[PDB]
Write a protein that binds this ligand. Sequence first.
Ligand SMILES: *C(=O)/C=C/c1ccc(O)cc1
Length: 125
Amino acid sequence: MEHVAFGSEDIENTLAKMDDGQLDGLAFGAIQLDGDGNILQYNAAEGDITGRDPKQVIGKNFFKDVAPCTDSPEFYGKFKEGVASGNLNTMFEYTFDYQMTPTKVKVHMKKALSGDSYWVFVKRV
Ligand SMILES: *C(=O)/C=C/c1ccc(O)cc1
């Protein structure tokens, strides 16, 4: 395991040092998105929660292609306000239900350290 707690205040500093292999050792799901919502990184824990194959979803658009249930003011709307303003730090519960058993999760979205990149962190609740 790579020990990092979900919700930690300096999580973007800690994860800036990790390659794809180290991201797969986290205890929670982690997705890195660019400012248009395309998936740059997607770890093994996220694939275990959602059933998606991490290697196949890289390069797809999260809001248009992979996760249409997040195309809503409650999720995508918060993301796009964050990208526009250049700052984002929000945590909320949500249900993922597209082509899968509905699964309740806690989501934490936070701007990365790398300029136009954004994290989505996910844990079961
Ligand atoms: C709703 O369509 C949610 C889908 C989803 C959430 C998170 C993922 O990693 C993959 C699909």
